[PDB]
Design a protein around this ligand. Structure first.
Ligand SMILES: NC(=O)c1ccc[n+]([C@@H]2O[C@H](COP(=O)([O-])OP(=O)(O)OC[C@H]3O[C@@H](n4cnc5c(N)ncnc54)[C@H](O)[C@@H]3O)[C@@H](O)[C@H]2O)c1
Ligand SMILES: NC(=O)c1ccc[n+]([C@@H]2O[C@H](COP(=O)([O-])OP(=O)(O)OC[C@H]3O[C@@H](n4cnc5c(N)ncnc54)[C@H](O)[C@@H]3O)[C@@H](O)[C@H]2O)c1
Ligand SMILES: CC(=O)N[C@H]1[C@@H](OP(=O)(O)OP(=O)(O)OC[C@H]2O[C@@H](n3ccc(=O)[nH]c3=O)[C@H](O)[C@@H]2O)O[C@H](CO)[C@H](O)[C@@H]1O
Ligand SMILES: CC(=O)N[C@H]1[C@@H](OP(=O)(O)OP(=O)(O)OC[C@H]2O[C@@H](n3ccc(=O)[nH]c3=O)[C@H](O)[C@@H]2O)O[C@H](CO)[C@H](O)[C@@H]1O
Lengths: 308, 307
């Protein structure tokens, strides 16, 4: 049985990927420092699962972790953009050095396929209010965003210089069960859903007209598995957004209806770094992957709410 | 007023150090002497202070910026090929040193930093076209990705912490003290050393390739203006002259300077070589006082006369 190394596999997106890889018959090795990841997210009773707790920027750990692995999915990073604004030096280790060290370890081990979690943040404000195509000029505004873009550049260098096979995916806004809502900068759907379940007020920053291209985690996981299994993945990046439009106000009403309970909406000022309109151009994604019928917002919110 | 020059013992840096001392600045050099040479520096000037160490070293940088009014950040492993051979080690010099400097400048309250970026951030996208600053980016090596990442971090420190970066993308700089010791050294430093020594040169390709060559003294003038301008622009500026010199032109010009003919061996075209590279220097002309730059023949004669 083939083995998949998944960095950041104990986190929100990773642990769902781990569940799906195991069900398909893969062996899975998780590398995670448990900074936001959780052992309780993993099916520790699965004989096909191994867990290494450590830093993904640690070259000695990566030299051990890649041995016996046939492919990689690189999800480890400090996901909070705001954390990179507060501490660019520390987060640069997790958000870029880990990518560089993984490229070194994969090339030494002879492993070619790596699926990489890049981010819509590399566009910055360029293309706002339009479907953002992948060749939109880049404008990373934070150390996180610049580190994701730098990661793409280095992955492409190892592709051309050393035969690596990167699958670069720029996630738009992912949501669903296990997304951690404990931070004021957690994803808005995890925060809003947690408050609605508890019967407590949510806070809306701005007028609510901001739009996001939300993707339910199970649809992203399908794309991640396809990235591991495709015979000759494209060299350049692929947006993972649906090209859908959801205002925060749409989200508030849909969530309130699903919860069956009243929802108080308090106000706060528009966030300083807030992009108003964000939407992916889905053409490369629809050409390169079989999306099937993705979950609608309502379907994804219901699955989230019913899990808590 | 004291200026910190990281990489100040190198080719461009030491010419800058000379100019800054001549203008009355005190100058502090931070250099690890990997390629820089103390012989490039006017040691015992009494306005010159030399620190030897790693520009990525946090504690050394904290000392180096203390008492400094401005910074020129030239330290990097200049060789693209060394970054191909060792991405991990060169990332420390080519990017971490920039991040650590941003941190040290913010803590010490120093705003102005002139930064040596590079035409390599464009990859091959500039082939055959005047290369403007919004030419799409395609850094092909760790060196080029690190220069561009340095740019992005510098802009983040500008918006988040009040830094004043002057981002300059150098095209093909040449002149005295440029190390001709590598096969990948600048073509002018290699051809000039061979012409002075009366030894054959190797031309990779047909010699029709064109480059936008900039004599180091003209770049140094731009660097000083970056330090002294009252309100520099936030985005990058290409440093080229918009000049077009074929390698066959360069060979003929050097033959005429040296007085002897140059034997020219024929090599294959380098893989990935850009055939036609020219800056669109409109932003340079608008933001800086270019005066009358040295022609190629002028810069070649000054280089050749110093060998
Ligand atoms: N909307 C989204 O969720 C979204 C959007 C764009 C990009 N991404 C990217 O997707 C990936 C997964 O994010 P997520 O939403 O599941 O959040 P997450 O925080 O739950 O997952 C991040 C995981 O990485 C682990 N990790 C962090 N630093 C590490 C290190 N130095 N060494 C080892 N493990 C480390 C954490 O413990 C956690 O399990 C990240 O790269 C993130 O930046 C997510
Ligand atoms: N045509 C060109 O010469 C050209 C073109 C584009 C960019 N640049 C950039 O201009 C700057 C100067 O390059 P140069 O042509 O003068 O070459 P150079 O090698 O002579 O100068 C580089 C200097 O930086 C120093 N240095 C290197 N790593 C260091 C470290 N970790 N800590 C401290 N000092 C360190 C070296 O000792 C040397 O003195 C570099 O950033 C280079 O990438 C040059
Ligand atoms: C990539 O980051 P994003 O800003 O796209 O993701 P995000 O989930 O952090 O924010 C989505 C939107 O919801 C807003 N928001 C977020 C949290 C909250 O409690 N209330 C709220 O209104 C936030 O200002 C933003 O406009
Ligand atoms: C010295 C230098 O800064 N080189 C940089 C410059 O390369 P460039 O190719 O622009 O400059 P170069 O000086 O390395 O070479 C210019 C031309 O001369 C040719 N040639 C060179 C040596 C020789 O002995 N014979 C010969 O024919 C060479 O193949 C090339 O066609 O720009 C690139 C980015 O786009 C990289 O940043 C390179 O590192």
């Amino acid at each position: 049985a083939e083995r998949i190394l998944v960095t950041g596999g104990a986190g929100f997106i990773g642990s769902h990927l781990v569940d799906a890889l195991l069900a398909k018959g893969y062996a899975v090795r998780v590398l995670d420092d448990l900074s936001t990841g959780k052992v309780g997210n993993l099916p520790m009773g699965d004989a096909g699962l191994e867990l290494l707790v450590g830093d993904a920027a640690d070259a000695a750990l990566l030299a051990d972790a890649v041995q016996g692995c046939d492919a990689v999915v690189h999800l480890a990073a400090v996901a909070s953009v705001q954390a990179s604004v507060e501490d660019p030096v520390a987060t640069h280790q997790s958000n870029f050095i880990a990518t560089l060290r993984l490229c070194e370890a994969m090339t030494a081990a002879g492993i070619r396929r790596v699926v990489f979690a890049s981010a819509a943040a590399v566009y910055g404000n360029n293309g706002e209010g339009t479907p953002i195509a992948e060749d939109t000029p880049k404008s990373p505004l934070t150390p996180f965003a610049a580190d994701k873009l730098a990661s793409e550049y280095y992955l492409d260098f190892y592709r051309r210089q050393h035969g690596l096979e990167p699958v670069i995916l720029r996630f738009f806004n992912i949501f669903g069960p296990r997304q951690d809502p404990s931070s004021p900068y957690s994803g808005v759907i995890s925060i809003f859903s947690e408050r609605a379940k508890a019967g407590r007020p949510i806070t809306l920053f701005g007028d609510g007209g901001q739009t996001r291209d939300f993707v339910y985690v199970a649809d992203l996981v399908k794309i991640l598995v396809q990235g591991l299994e495709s015979p000759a993945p494209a060299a350049d990046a692929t947006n993972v957004g649906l090209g859908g439009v959801t205002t925060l106000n749409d989200l508030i009403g849909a969530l309130q209806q699903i919860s069956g309970k009243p929802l108080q909406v308090s106000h706060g000022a528009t966030r300083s770094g807030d992009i108003r309109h964000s939407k992916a151009d889905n053409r490369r994604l629809r050409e390169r992957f079989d999306l099937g019928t993705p979950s609608s917002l309502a379907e994804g919110l219901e699955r989230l709410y019913r899990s808590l």
